[model samples]
Target: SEQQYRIEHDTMGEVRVPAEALWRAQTQRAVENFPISGRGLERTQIRALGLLKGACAQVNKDLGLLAAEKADAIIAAAQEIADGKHDDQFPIDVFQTGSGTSSNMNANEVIASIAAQATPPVVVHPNDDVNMSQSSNDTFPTATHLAATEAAVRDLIPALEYLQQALATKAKAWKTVVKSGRTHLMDAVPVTLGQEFGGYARQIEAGIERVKATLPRLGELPIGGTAVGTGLNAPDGFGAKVVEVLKQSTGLSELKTASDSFEAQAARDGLVEGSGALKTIAASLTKIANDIRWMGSGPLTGLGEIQLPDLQPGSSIMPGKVNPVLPEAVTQVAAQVIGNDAAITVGGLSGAFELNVYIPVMARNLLESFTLLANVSRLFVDKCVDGLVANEDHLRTLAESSPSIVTPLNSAIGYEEAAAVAKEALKERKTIRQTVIDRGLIGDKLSIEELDKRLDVLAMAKVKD
Candidate 1:
């Protein structure tokens, strides 16, 4: 049974490969060599790789570097991969090659095998044919840029916009609801529920802008730099042609050739920069989620300022307990993205001498962050932010009783007198109005009518001229 397996040969020697395997010797050898993790390349990453190969094959055919029939077959097979048809054929571990050589070769072999089986029987070689004028050094990083940009544009940005819109809707609905604002987790001043939600919306807007700003650099690709960024043996104008084909194939019209091939291949700063933007968004999401959890903490003992949707039971022992599970899950996802950013930072620094060896891990981390952020942002918006209901009675009561409500009295009553009134109100656990009346803090200069009008908490929450 072992001897019955198909035989394939590479530079090393002969190997017994699977009979039905689309991959050849190099890929089979890699599959056996590195069993480190069962994890393979992500579908997005694989699709980007396929896009690169398909574009390159078309470019080569246009430039007369590859025969017409072979190019057609390779292009057809590559399109299949790009459409996510051959994901399982990529069995090599993501942990395998620093340069992503195994993955590059894996694509090469699979495409070659598929091409060789075409009706016309075009015998395409993996390296010279499918991967013509490209190196893992250049192509892998190019694919990384493509994958990150596509994920951000196609997935993350849309999800963030959806969340922002949901927040804006909530903000508009809560415009008239006033509540006590906190500074350093202590009562400070008065603000409307609308203002709090508006702030979250603005943060999401800024994050979307930050992600957009990182795309120009990410669009630069180092494709024609075969082997060591030299463009050695590659045909003239090959890089530009490849980028044009890439734009048409991937529908990413912004894709372009690198100004300096050497620099593009030498570092992965584009991904690092993109990840930094992602980290900022993650941080924003974390703050938003934490605030929601705190505000919705308790219906009895905690702030009770707002109520999140009751999705599921919070505890086994405590009956009728509901947790802010959506926000909690989003916070955890944010933490993971932050951790991924740190690893990406370290990976960014590994660009020593002429190349970065940590790109495989960096690519993995970047894509993971993108996918996690996209999914959670949508979930948080739909399951948490959209259904939130403010506790109007509780918020008004707290706003009326807070000692900090005496803040506006400072100019009229003087700071010392205002501080005294605040302290007395807190000590008595009474409304500032009752405390001021009991203490006789209101003098002849400030009438009860004028004091009530001037100390309008709702008015304080509104924008003033």
Candidate 2:
């Protein structure tokens, strides 16, 4: 048999991108020219760049800027690629390439190859035609903003929302189940298992909303800033026209013209803000992952509040070991997102007067954060949260017996009285109810029934806001 059969007989998305050789040469040049971050451009970024290019071509055509023959061919190829065809030709190297020149060249070479092979010399040059009225200066950052917006709205937020719902489901399911609550790693009071999970669910819900709230600013693009933030050679209405096509191509209803193309290109506060959202999400995920891991900690010595599905052997050296691997994986991704946020923040500050010099770092980090959040959010829902089973016996035993559960008794009897009673109860190994009744506080107009109601750890943990 042949070394490998080329199984792909046709392409999807009605486009066939060429520039195979050019793409190779360009990528190789980038590799040789800048051996940086060791992280290549992510697929999300590539897809965004491709989307921007396609949108630009269509916009040019709409404005009567692109020649008919050239415009049609470029659109067809870009569409094919967009529709998921000819992926093999996008073989650019990793994200570490500095300044994103590799990505720009990769895009250019691909478009050029696709155009050159077509009838009537498609003439859809990547620079002069397809990316007409643009520059890496403008296009790279523009694509970055759009990519961050798209990845979050289309992928990241949805996945996180699903996870939030999953957490909500668990919270609601276990709403009545009480357990010992801890703060600063010390036993504090009693709370329902549902409360902790519900808090996490709310965090995720808020995170999704927070990210969406930041999208409008991200939709402000830098298309008109040819090289720097100055329109330079671009036609009068070119910027507005491109925005219109981008809205159509990306299906983002809120895409709009940037207030100042100059500021849009030179300042990355928008990136800073968007990355800040990702950073916040990353922090929340860290909290959730930490919570889940702790909750699932023990079959014996650990808290063992909830049972996580045992996905694999936790260790080779220890027998009968099962670790919270899913939560651990989520934590790893959270770290990466946090790290990406830091990188983008640094890059946002590194921009010079007319151009953001650190864009390669900024774009790469932003894209990485988005991918990490999206992938981890999905995994958390499917692999971890969905598989969780409540340790009901554990919850009940801990709740009923825990001395920490008597914190609410303080309010009725006063902190000192309640403390003395709880201390005596602990010394005598009796429950708080017994201690309260024995202390005579319950009979002295102090109703234990009210204490019972207020002692709900679930309600205690909830913030009024």
Candidate 3:
């Protein structure tokens, strides 16, 4: 029993911690206090927190506030945490303290404990040294910004770029494959599959630009404004110094101190802005996924303008039926990301006078959106978009069969005459060209050859010059 437990004490009092635990007293108390979610901070968030602590230690050493040996030990320990070690030691729930005090203390205590065990050992205090010149208010917001920016730049952006390229490749391959376009789910003018895919590519490109635009704000940090944005106990240049070291440590050269500490601490506008970009991306993905599923609808009774890869069976009972599983999966991911953005919007509005009290939830939701989008974007590109095959016969048949195919003849025959032809074609289930020919809608002015030339599907789709 004695070997199974060790006593640890914080300002609140003593608590029995596991003998094998790497974190100390405050963390032990937090682990007991918040068991709301079995989830801990995300890997990116934990790494960001660790990087913040390490940068602080280095900054304190540079400022002459902490001894070299103690700062070195703290830096070493914190760097290991940043490298993603001892993840199990961080047990505080993501739903803990509105200001994320428990998570900050969890980092402080863990780094201090590990630092105290350094070679030749050093007496590293959590609050007095490891967390020197920082408070949960500033550090948590700083970590949120850092983690979100890193996730976007490192993961989500690359995935989106890849998806964009995949779409462009598909567009080029299907440039001549013309199909009927739909507006309000009703037949409209013809469009090339290439044009549809090119539009999707443009959507992803715009989404990437939107995400990158938020990075400058996300890179701006509020780390120096300890306890209500005052920077009371912080050194004059501590925040800037920490950011410089963070740039070197994380290899994120774009990291910088907030232009306005008070604003940065008091509002999560940067995160809200980033979440807005993510919501836009989700909407883009939803549109693309829905389009793909619609085009790949069915082999027998649906549009079937394109065919997705036969990755899996559509149903347990429906043999020989393959589904557009990738697009379906991506659509569901888009839905969740959209929902997460809404929750983050609510969390962003929870800021009071000096700080947003809902940062923990906001951070979780934003990171979840970034991660989900990154993974699904990659999955959809590799599995579905890249391998899709255009249904040339079906596309040609539909484009030629559509009564709206007479749209190009509107200028030749006048709108009223063209409208009458379209109605008759639809009512009689005849091809628009044949109906127009049967009715002599254009009279003797245009021959069958001239009508055929004017109604060229490739010309209507603008795929040919």
Candidate 4:
């Protein structure tokens, strides 16, 4: 067995914690109570919790509210937690305690236990000392924001940039590979593969802006508003100093003690807005991925406008069948992100006057969304977008034969006349040039041979200066 019975007592009486785990009474109670998801918070989540605990102790020491030895011990213990040395100790499920009190107490108990058990041990109570001037009402939300803000900065933004740059590179490389443009899944005019992929790059660029736009709000902290909107039991300048220490410790320079502590404590609007931004990014990625899959649909029968890299066997029964696995995988990530956003949106509606109690679920979904988008975006570039090969022969054939290639001729011939020509080309299954040649069309003294030359399809792909 990995555990030995370690008896601990809390307000409700005795609790059994595993001796192997550093956590004590309250953390064990939460573990028993919420087994809903069987999932624990991610490393960043616990790291934020550890960072918050350490910063709290630092502020308490500086404020003369805490004795030197105890404060230093608590801060050191929490520093280990922040460094991810004791991640396994805080094993409470993400579905526990709507206000995230369970996990908050988990951090408190782990820090207190470690500090109390250290060399030249000091007496430190989890509630009275470790959580001094703090409440789950404030600290969990603050930590949630801290973790999410850092994730966006360190992971999500860079992933988006990499994906965008890859698309831009591909777009530049395929600038002259003209293909038939499509609208409503029907042939339209001609467009370069560069032009299509450039649109995908722009979508990712805007996604970066949307995620960045939510940062100021996500960086706002509600540390001082302990228990409720009112800053009861906390020193007047406690939150600002905590934030300063947090910035120093975590390297999150954008951290701020929220101006309106009540609003910060009462609502999760920042997380909600951040989730919305993530959802928008997923939508854009979905469109880009779907378009790629469609473009690379076939080797023999489908659109065949582009050739996606062969990553794996597409069919289990059929041999030599390679499919667009990366695009499919990226689109599935998009679906999951969209669902996570919906869950986060629902979690946002729990703002009940004094506080929103849906902290755990909201934070979980937000963190998951950030992680998924970042991971998928990175893989999307390396596996799919960067390696795409334009179907040059197929693109030329489709562009040369498209009935809508007659669109530009509307300015020369009468609109009705061009429409008739397009209809003729479609019925005859003829190339626009061949159709016009057979019809002997010479509009406004435009020579027949010159008219044929004017129908150069790839020329229509680019805009004239």
Candidate 5:
């Protein structure tokens, strides 16, 4: 028993499209031609496509290029796709037709099939009607930027805000707790865990700003630049009119006609810029997660400075062992996001003389980065940051006893002598204060009480008011 198929014809020839699929000849051809990724575009991209098609229909009707009845039917069908009610109607792989002609056709064909079934039996042409005044070269990128911008604003930014607030709250509470800060994996100076957490929060806040900065440009779309940047087939003011519809429909006030349709369609500079910001955020997350994991390491033998949530048994063979699983998960997502940025950058560079030839892959990668970063940011907060428990005694003990605390005595003892005292303290298994007192470095210029007070390592650990 083989799957049933219906004969669908396009410009090239006839194809055996899936019997029940709304997508027709061109889409069926792509589904058979490129089975590369075993993945479809992200749901948001699909929604973007649907929204774009709907907006185009509305604009075409407004521009008097399409009849009201046909446009109304097309808009209704496009809305279904935009609302994610017809996701299955699109079956092309993300790797198909670098310009996303396949995806664009998938939308056109599905909308046509749906509109043709309207109560009055409207006859809709997938290319002539549904895709009137547009080409994959322009529409693909419009959807690409539209989806990326929307997801960044609607999803990624909010998730980062959640993480940033969570970190700030933790930092505020831990403000008074002093700990030894490590540089190059070696104990360096005294600091509060709160200050460290605060720094991580600042990184997230900065990341949010960087992501937001990409939105204005990303919102500039290439909707009316049909085949080339000239808008030859599209009517005058078509791009502006479509953008107006998009802005209101998507509720993305940032939406606007590309200032230079040629640039928007010829090169995905905005999408690439957005990807760069996302990449930077991924790097920041990597650093923060890596630090958290290192700090949370070892309940008995490792850093043991902070305790992460004991999510589950860490080892199957070993008893009562726990690992920093959440940080590891975040770091992995960060790695993948970095990889996605690389792909988007490369794909964006494929912008040829007239149009970019790599819309589908770039759009997919950018969307994935948004989804992954947005999802992992929230999970990191809930599963890891929220449950952190600083080992107060261990942190204070380590900070108070480190030989490097002699750093503050530099003014009195001189740098070399202080360095010697630090080395001798560690070698003799004595504290820096003990070593300084035993050596009589002050030479009676200061009494034992004064020297001890001056070398108060715990006091040095704090931020001075």
Candidate 6:
């Protein structure tokens, strides 16, 4: 069937609007306006946008500016759309527009049109009534902040939480399990598998805290500052009323208006800080993923310390082949996030005297970072981390046979003697325990348990705290 679209005028000339749905306009215009490219908003950011809009609408109703019945209708409709229904009205085109005007219009129309559902069809006003007390300059940035923050809380935080829990779960399950530890990518000493998993879990815990710490900043909104600040033309009391309403609707702390409204619309430092939190999550996830990838390498020919559930066949042409596609995908996403952070950094510098022209690009890219992080977090938890099986036979064998256990013995034996023993044990192909036994380095009274207890790598040697 032939699709219908709008023909809006612009200095770029009368461009054919090919987007069938309103939401798609955001993407379409983005495609046409800025040829510069990279990843866009993450699911966290998208969630934040929904939250921001819902919050503001709530404020509008509470202020008595928007009719309660009409606002309720809009809420019902928007909520329906947010739940992933109403695909046609949410065309990607609306958000893709450079100015975000299309998105604002689309929301106004959708909300008003929903109100009209009780009255005349298509009779509700989109902008005049539905979007009163707001302007794109304020609403869009506010929404961008909301969306970015929501993404962090909803999916990214949980993912980190799960990752931490996943690692903790493995550590608890592997309490008595022991394996060889490596340093500088070289065999070092025997350590409990549980301890290693505990460390993994702890890393995620810290990452989660990092994310939580950033929430307050993201929660701040510019909604009241309207336009280029000065709260221009907003009806008296609109700002405070809207702030209160938005807070009630979204379950976020009511954001205070920026002290300097001019700075509110000028740039997105709060957003940049939010992205940094996500980047921190990415850093932690990458470490976990990289560790898992290496551990899950070749079941026969590679490290094989841990066994990853086979998600799909590795190669199309080769038989008996498997690849860590999920981890690979996560790795790619982490790299993208890192790169996205760099772009945001550049955008931060690009903020000139009045406004940050790169906001559209910044918002989208930051949103993309949140989404990929959240999705990858889910995939990792469900597919890789949840069902991950320890290569017990392999880990046990490696643990028993390693000569690296003597590394901690150095504290007592001196570096020279320890190094010599370590080298000789490896060269002689004897386990550190066996070498110690043969060399009579310790009295027979000294038990293997005592020697094992003597070397605590995670505790004193390479400890961060």
What lDDT, from 0 to 1, does candidate 5 have? Answer: 0.88
Q: How well is each residue in 273-362 modelled by candidate 3, as lDDT tens digits?
A: 999998999899999999999899988888878788888778999889888888888888888988988898898888899988899999
Clashes of 5: 0
- Poorly placed runs, candidate 3 (over 4 Å): 1-3, 443-447
Identify the runs in model 5 with alpha carbons over 4 angstroms from their true place.
443-450, 462-465
Evaluated at residue 126, the lDDT of candidate 4 is: 92
Across 1-465, the per-residue lDDT of candidate 6 in tens digits comes to: 788666643344554566444333333454455444433433333444445456556667776777776666666656654554544553433235443655565566545545556544444355656566777777777777767666677667887777778788888887666677778887766666677777878877887887788777666667777766767766666666666665676665635566567776787787788778778767877777888899889868888888888999888898978888888988899899988988877776676655665666677778788888878877888888878888777776776565666766776667787777878888997766667667677765466676767644333233221
TM-scores for the candidates: 0.96, 0.87, 0.96, 0.96, 0.96, 0.80
Measured with C-alpha atoms, the lDDT of residue 53 in candidate 5 is: 93
- How far off is residue 181 in model 5, in Å? 1.2
Ranking 2 against 6 by lDDT, winner: 2
Give each model's whole-structure lDDT: 0.87, 0.75, 0.88, 0.88, 0.88, 0.67
lDDT of 4 by residue, 1-465 (tens): 556888988899998888787888988989999989889889999999999999999899999998889899999998999999998898899999889999999999999889878998888999999999999999999999999999898989999999999999988888888888999988889988888888999999999999988989988989999989688989988998999898887787778988798899889988999999999998999999999999998788888888888887889898998988888888898898899888988989878998998888999999999998999889898888888888799888888767888887766776887888888888878767767667767655456766765677888887431
Candidate 5 has what TM-score? 0.96
What is the per-residue lDDT of model 5 for residues 170-225, given as tens digits with 9 covering 90 to 100?
Answer: 88988878888777778787888988999999999999999988888988898888
Task: Give the residue spans of candidate 4 off by over 4 A.
Answer: 1-3, 437-440, 443-445, 463-465
Positional deviation of 454 in candidate 4, in angstroms? 3.7
lDDT of 1: 0.87
Model 2 worst lDDT run, 10 consecutive residues = 4-13
Writing each residue's lDDT as its tens digit, candidate 1 over 65-139 gives 888988899999999999999998999997887778989999999999888887877899898899888888988
